[PDB]
Amino acid sequence: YHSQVVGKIGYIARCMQTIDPENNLKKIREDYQDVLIWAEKNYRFEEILEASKSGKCPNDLDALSRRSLILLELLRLVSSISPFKMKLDLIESQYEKMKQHVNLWKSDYHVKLNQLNQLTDYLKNAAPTPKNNFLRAMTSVLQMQIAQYGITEDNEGINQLFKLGLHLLAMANEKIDEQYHLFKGYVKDQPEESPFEGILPAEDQKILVKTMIDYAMPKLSSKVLQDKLSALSSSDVLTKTLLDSIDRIV
Amino acid sequence: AFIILDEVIKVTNRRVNAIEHVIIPRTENTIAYINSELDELDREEFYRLKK
Amino acid sequence: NTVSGVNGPLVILEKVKFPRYNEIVNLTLPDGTVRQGQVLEIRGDRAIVQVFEGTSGIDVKKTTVEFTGESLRIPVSEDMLGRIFDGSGRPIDNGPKVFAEDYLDINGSPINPYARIYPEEMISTGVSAIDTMNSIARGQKIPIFSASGLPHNEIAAQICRQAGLVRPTKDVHDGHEENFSIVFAAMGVNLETARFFKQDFEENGSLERTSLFLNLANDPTIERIITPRLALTTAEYLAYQTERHVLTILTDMSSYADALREVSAAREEVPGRRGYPGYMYTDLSTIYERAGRVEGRNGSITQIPILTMPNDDITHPIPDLTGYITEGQIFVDRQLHNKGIYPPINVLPSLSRLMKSAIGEGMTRKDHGDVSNQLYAKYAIGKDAAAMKAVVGEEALSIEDKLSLEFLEKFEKTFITQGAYEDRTVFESLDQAWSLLRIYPKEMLNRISPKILDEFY
Amino acid sequence: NTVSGVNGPLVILEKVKFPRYNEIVNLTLPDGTVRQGQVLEIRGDRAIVQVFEGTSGIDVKKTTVEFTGESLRIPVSEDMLGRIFDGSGRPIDNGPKVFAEDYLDINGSPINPYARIYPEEMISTGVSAIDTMNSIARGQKIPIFSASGLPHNEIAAQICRQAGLVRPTKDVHDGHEENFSIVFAAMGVNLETARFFKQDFEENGSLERTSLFLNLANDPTIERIITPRLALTTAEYLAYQTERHVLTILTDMSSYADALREVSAAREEVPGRRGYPGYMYTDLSTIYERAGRVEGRNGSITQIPILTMPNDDITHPIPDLTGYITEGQIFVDRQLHNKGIYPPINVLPSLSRLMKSAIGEGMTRKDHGDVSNQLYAKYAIGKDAAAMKAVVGEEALSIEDKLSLEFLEKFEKTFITQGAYEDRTVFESLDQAWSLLRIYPKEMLNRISPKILDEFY
Amino acid sequence: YGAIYSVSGPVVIAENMIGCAMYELVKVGHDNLVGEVIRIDGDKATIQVYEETAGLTVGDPVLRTGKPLSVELGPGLMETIYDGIQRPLKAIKEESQSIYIPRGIDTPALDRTIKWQFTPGKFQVGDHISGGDIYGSVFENSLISSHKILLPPRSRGTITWIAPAGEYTLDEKILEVEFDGKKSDFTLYHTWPVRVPRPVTEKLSADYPLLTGQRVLDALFPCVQGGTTCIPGAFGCGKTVISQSLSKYSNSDAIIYVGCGERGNEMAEVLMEFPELYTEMSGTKEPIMKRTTLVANTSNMPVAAREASIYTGITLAEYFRDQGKNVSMIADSSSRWAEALREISGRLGEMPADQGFPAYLGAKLASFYERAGKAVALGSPDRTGSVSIVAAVSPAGGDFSDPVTTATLGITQVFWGLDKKLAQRKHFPSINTSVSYSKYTNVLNKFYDSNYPEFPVLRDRMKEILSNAEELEQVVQLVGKSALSDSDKITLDVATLIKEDFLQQNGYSTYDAFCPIWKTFDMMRAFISYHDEAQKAVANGANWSKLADSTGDVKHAVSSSKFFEPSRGEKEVHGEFEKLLSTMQERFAESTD
């Protein structure tokens, strides 16, 4: 009872110290002053348990764990968007809007954060392939759009990138045709002119264009089409004009 | 013959429903209650003898 | 002293006979958890005590015992509303404080607040068949009978939700003269079943008008059996202290009978029929004895227990003893719930021996008992005509079986049809039963008087 | 030391720590008669053992104690087949010691011979209807349901004598070419049934490949209950040591259940309902534990238990606990034996679990399940048309009901009917099912392929 | 410590014992046999011997383990087959070359040679810790949620020593606790008894959904994780195919299979069928065996391991639910646990109830049913988890009127009535809509219907279509075929396609028996839109035979929904179901005229 409240106060103090390292989020640290006050003072565990049992420390470990799940969801959402950084005002307004919700687990926000954490966790153990490169670029664009737009505003690009990442994760390594068709449809359906310019490196876009040119190159039987399609593999950028020019040559 | 078959079809349709409706529940409930009472009534003498 | 051994939920400890019977004792274990128990037997050089919390993991020479020196009593107060806790004598979940200012005994006769006169009032629960065909009043006991196939928990939560809102319409309609109080006690129930009842009670009403009593399924039966004494002591102290009507929901009776009937073989006593103990009639009679009017003529204790059949047969001693001990009888039918009737409460086997005292005569009409008896006889005649329509149908059926089948179909599909939160009244139920009973002929309505039948003919 | 007392079949001996668990002891009496027994229960400063020779006649102030130093075990070797022994584990052939170099316990195998894969290769039992309709694979438990009105001992002796003959045709067909063994254990049988089973098994030539276990009704219940453990331990040791399929027949289970029920009142444990003990599931599960494919994928231990009912009633706990552990059962009909069929077994009440995977390759055809489904449907349609033909009449029956009624009598008197020494295989039963199903037209069978149906029409 | 007082049958009595609890495990005799004290009367304690009691005499010493009999909770639980008492048979199968554990040998719950990579968590030195908090993690899986190392339950204090990143064994200590000076040494694995409930923050109703791969289950009721439902078995004739099809077709991160009283063929068929069959999510490196836990106990095993197998599986499912993942627990069956409890009660010598069932089966069944469920994860992280308790119901007294089957149906809030005639035709699962019922359909229909759910209107019309189709088949069989209108033929035609598509599913397929909830909701809405368009077109004046030819490709396209794969660019979204509404509206517009 009191040990879970003291451990939630210490974990809330460690998560509060890991959230704001310079005291930039005064609204998030202002509500946690009652639990952060006991963490900044040298005291034993028996004084924290006896203070929590006698009403002198923070109680309601179920209700404190309910807000602690929202703070852990905000810290996991802010940590899952690495290495991109979000705005302090958008992080404070998203933390206030997420903290002002009646339920933080009965919605698509926790399932979308769990799916983004599973997609980012699946990219840690991988190898060089087109599905890992397309899923890494879609996870990077979904992380940039998730860091730019937050988790409190619905967006079609984040749902399309999450559905393309879950559909790419649901397929095996013998689905280069469906990953190439889904990558061509997702690339052609993107409203931006370049979805990999500014987030992903030039070697990943050149490796993806070289992978698509190398994939579509074995189906051709002409020397002029193989030379013209092979001459476009030296580009370091990715755009819809390269996909339309590569599709027009084949 | 058609009037006799049409006359017998109502009695067969009534007896087929009544015989299936009234048959199973009295013997099933009486057999289940008799076996349920006979089980504890048989086990009580062995429990009292073992005690 | 020290515990000699442990067998099941009872712990056999060796100690002197200086402590009295029913003395509270605490067992000190090396795991850092203290358990409370009651001394059930005292003898020379040995004693028998039953632990309320915990069933295994008690060492012989690694544990110790301590004598508190106080009798078994639960502190009852007037601040039990708006507090969440469990019934073990103290808050197990570390919720609200169970401390109070008055001490009441749990032996069954603390002050003897039982009424010595026949009560006369009209209890409204929102059900037309339960209010009209049951004849409930203040201080009347009515048990809810369910099975394993039908939703007895949703029917009890819907009946409690309709009874919680039907009481203010009767209090504004001059059917009572005091405040209403709820007593919720769960024993052997899951958290998902209690969360639906707490969500239905919070949605239909508030969280301060009822009491929080939760029992976990991973605890012993002795800890769950102690919840009815604290709930009856809190309902009797709250109903006697403030002069308010207390409505207690006892769910489930199968767990309370499964605790005392559960520990009946590991002791030296001989059990009864069906493996139950021979003192279950005094155990259920001790909880059923604390019902009726309160002292002052302004109090009352209503008991609405929820019983679940564990075999689906009438040969169980818990439904016959619980229905015979209680003043009412409410039976639920799975066939009515399967057809789409909500709530599927059958009025055919429902019969109470206190319909005259349960029927009101100062806040309602006097024809409610005769209209309820004629509607019950016409409902039983419509059920026998429905069985005749099941057997023959259109080969031996007369005009009386067709009129009784049409009145049983219209009364079964009109009176037993309702929602989950709407409430009704006895005045509207009397005109609704008179409208369905108006289709019967004058030759078949000879059981009623001609003066009352001629006014509504 | 000396004998403390004697009450019934239990003997009270003076022993503190001398006898071990299951250790054999020898009682030295001064009357010139020595008796040996097994320690059924060991306690502090006392011993309760049941002697296998006699049930009385021991002194209480003149007996002596002797330690044998050898626990109760069955010697498993390659010379156990082709000889008759007793139920306690001693030979009765009047010859030298047939003890082998392997000693295994009778309370379970210590090598973990339990199977971990589904059985694919099928085993032949010498019955066309038992092989086609309810055929079991290697390592499957299929019991034979009998009663007190049919020859269940002659049915088990016919299955034991008919077994071991299809292995040469199956080995010639490129199927099961390994060595096959048979475990024969008799409990509660008479001397005429054992001499008729040994004389009947010696004529066909299956007595040399099988083992003979003789347990009479006048012997102790501990020897009859310990008699199947020697056959299951010898079948498991021979199946695991040599990698050969061994099929054991245990008859009868009613004598073992009566011997276990008789010993339930001698021990301190109280019996269950219906007079039998409440621990019969562990006793039947201990004998049923030695069953399944052996380690290696080259051997398996098959068990065919026989259960006899007093009146074919399923209210006893032996049929529910015995049928619940086994994957199906074959019931013997009493009307088929009175009609003249041998063996009178019905395919409608019987059931087989995993019948679509209990057929191997190279010894059985793939159309056995499709022909058995159409044969079972034609047998059920003939069984319904036989009872409906008497009520309907000879001039009001269906066209397919007459051919199904003739196919029920022809299939019952052609497929079910068979001699006591008539061996059959899967090809003979498949050809007989195709010959019996040839009377029906091509438009009445849809449970088979058109190539196999048109090829073997 | 103690001495063997007497040995009679499977239960052995030991005298000279003190300081022994009601669940402490000890080794009696010199062979070190596994056992547990069931009861204690006076100075002598009564212990039940799980192993063979042959070769044990009075006078041998009894050494207790010094703690309660429990199992180890750490890395390496998945991809291993063990018994109900935490005895790994896979480790003994390599060295000893046997199936089960032999007499005189006892293996631990966790191996001493398998090592896992220990990763540091979000904690540090000086910060307070408690039970259930995120103390670390171990990378063992890549297709599901990893098994993160948590703190020990019922223990707290300050983290004085934190282990660094690296590979270490489970026997070596890597964690230290600072409380009252030197508190104790901690390791990767944790000890907890199986007869005690696991700690948690708070339990609530089931409102968290999860993938299951059941078209009839998601079509009949709302799919969620954390509910309690009971279904009838077949004694190995279709129950293991439904359990293996439910565990294999389910897309959960963890799986818990517990075999209490099985015959042994279904455990070997499920264990051998688990690694040979791939998952629906395209898992690799043992996706089906590594993602699930194997607990198989045969009928010839001890009753203590068969009764404690549900406690060990409920403890592992409680640890997997406390880790922050949704796991589905498949148990079969409660009749073997009640029969093992009745055999242990008759072997111990107590007085049982009628039918051989004691009074502890109701409290143990209520604690077992209340122990599993969906709730918030305990600890400082406050994660979300769910535990779906699916236990089979079989007979134990020769009929359905026994106290085990009737008592188990009362505690459960969900009921699924399987059909033996549908299971005999090689069709599974086939749940009857009349006998079926669920109490969590309101909260699941409102929570799933909060964003954009259509499961309640399609489920009510789907169950009412089969319920009206049964009365239409009974009236067509009783009265005749030429007595019904076009509405009964359209309702029977929709009930034949809905029952043939949902009820006619196969358990041996991979992509024809598994689909998402959006494909089942769109498939039910496509049939409900065709039934409503057929009723509206028939209400405006039209022939049934003319409307049947007027449908055309809509009936074959709606009937052919059980043979197409759900992958068309996304796992849930399908454009072919979206085009069937416009094509069904265009055919319904010309069908009316």
From Swiss-Prot, chain B:
Compartment annotation: Vacuole membrane
Domain of life: Eukaryota
Family: Belongs to the V-ATPase D subunit family.
Known function: Subunit of the V1 complex of vacuolar(H+)-ATPase (V-ATPase), a multisubunit enzyme composed of a peripheral complex (V1) that hydrolyzes ATP and a membrane integral complex (V0) that translocates protons. V-ATPase is responsible for acidifying and maintaining the pH of intracellular compartments.
Miscellaneous comment as given in the Swiss-Prot or TrEMBL entry: Present with 8500 molecules/cell in log phase SD medium.
Subunit structure: V-ATPase is a heteromultimeric enzyme composed of a peripheral catalytic V1 complex (components A to H) attached to an integral membrane V0 proton pore complex (components: a, c, c', c'', d, e, f and VOA1). Interacts with RAV1 and RAV2 components of the RAVE complex, which are essential for the stability and assembly of V-ATPase.
Protein name as catalogued: V-type proton ATPase subunit D
Lineage: Eukaryota, Fungi, Dikarya, Ascomycota, Saccharomycotina
Gene that encodes the chain: VMA8
Portion of the full sequence shown: 155 to 205 of 256
Curated annotation (Swiss-Prot), chains C, D:
Membrane topology of this protein: Peripheral membrane protein
Major localisation: membrane
Molecular-function GO terms, alphabetical: ATP binding; proton-transporting ATPase activity, rotational mechanism
Record SUPFAM superfamilies: P-loop containing nucleoside triphosphate hydrolases
CDD domains registered for this protein in UniProt: ATP-synt_V_A-type_beta_C (cd18112), ATP-synt_V_A-type_beta_N (cd18118), V_A-ATPase_B (cd01135)
Modified sites of kind Phosphoserine: S109
InterPro entries tied to this protein: ATP-synt_VA_C (IPR055190), ATPase_a/bsu_AS (IPR020003), ATPase_F1/V1/A1_a/bsu_N (IPR004100), ATPase_F1/V1/A1_a/bsu_nucl-bd (IPR000194), ATPase_V1-cplx_bsu (IPR005723), P-loop_NTPase (IPR027417), V-ATPase_su_B/beta (IPR022879)
Source superkingdom: Eukaryota
Cellular localisation: Vacuole membrane
Binding site for ATP: R353
Assembly: V-ATPase is a heteromultimeric enzyme composed of a peripheral catalytic V1 complex (components A to H) attached to an integral membrane V0 proton pore complex (components: a, c, c', c'', d, e, f and VOA1). Interacts with RAV1 and RAV2 components of the RAVE complex, which are essential for the stability and assembly of V-ATPase.
Assigned protein family: Belongs to the ATPase alpha/beta chains family.
Miscellaneous comment in the UniProt entry for this protein: Present with 131000 molecules/cell in log phase SD medium.
Summary of the function given for this chain in its UniProt record: Non-catalytic subunit of the V1 complex of vacuolar(H+)-ATPase (V-ATPase), a multisubunit enzyme composed of a peripheral complex (V1) that hydrolyzes ATP and a membrane integral complex (V0) that translocates protons. V-ATPase is responsible for acidifying and maintaining the pH of intracellular compartments.
Annotated protein name in UniProt: V-type proton ATPase subunit B
Lineage, broadest ranks: Eukaryota, Fungi, Dikarya, Ascomycota, Saccharomycotina
UniProtKB/Swiss-Prot annotation, chain E:
Record CDD domains: ATP-synt_V_A-type_alpha_C, ATP-synt_V_A-type_alpha_N, Hint, V_A-ATPase_A
GO BP: ATP metabolic process; endosomal lumen acidification; Golgi lumen acidification; intein-mediated protein splicing; intron homing; proton transmembrane transport; vacuolar acidification
Catalytic activity, as annotated: ATP + H2O + 4 H(+)(in) = ADP + phosphate + 5 H(+)(out)
Keywords for the protein's UniProt record, in alphabetical order: Acetylation, ATP-binding, Autocatalytic cleavage, DNA-binding, Endonuclease, Hydrogen ion transport, Hydrolase, Intron homing, Ion transport, Membrane, Nuclease, Nucleotide-binding, Phosphoprotein, Protein splicing, Translocase, Transport, Vacuole
The EC number(s) this enzyme carries: 7.1.2.2, 3.1.-.-
Membrane-topology descriptor: Peripheral membrane protein
Database matches in PROSITE patterns: ATPASE_ALPHA_BETA, INTEIN_C_TER, INTEIN_ENDONUCLEASE, INTEIN_N_TER
Pfam families registered for this protein in UniProt: ATP-synt_ab, ATP-synt_ab_N, ATP-synt_ab_Xtn, ATP-synt_VA_C, Hom_end, Hom_end_hint
UniProt PTM comment: This protein undergoes a protein self splicing that involves a post-translational excision of the VDE intervening region (intein) followed by peptide ligation.
One annotated GO molecular function: ATP binding
Ranges that cross the membrane: none
Protein localization: Vacuole membrane
Residue positions binding ATP: G233, A234, F235, G236, C237, G238, K239, T240
Family statement drawn from the similarity comment of this UniProt entry: Belongs to the ATPase alpha/beta chains family.
Other remarks in the entry: Present with 199895 molecules/cell in log phase SD medium.
Oligomer and partners: V-ATPase is a heteromultimeric enzyme composed of a peripheral catalytic V1 complex (components A to H) attached to an integral membrane V0 proton pore complex (components: a, c, c', c'', d, e, f and VOA1). Interacts with RAV1 and RAV2 components of the RAVE complex, which are essential for the stability and assembly of V-ATPase.
Name the UniProt record assigns to this protein: V-type proton ATPase catalytic subunit A
Organism: Saccharomyces cerevisiae (strain ATCC 204508 / S288c)
Classification lineage: Eukaryota, Fungi, Dikarya, Ascomycota, Saccharomycotina
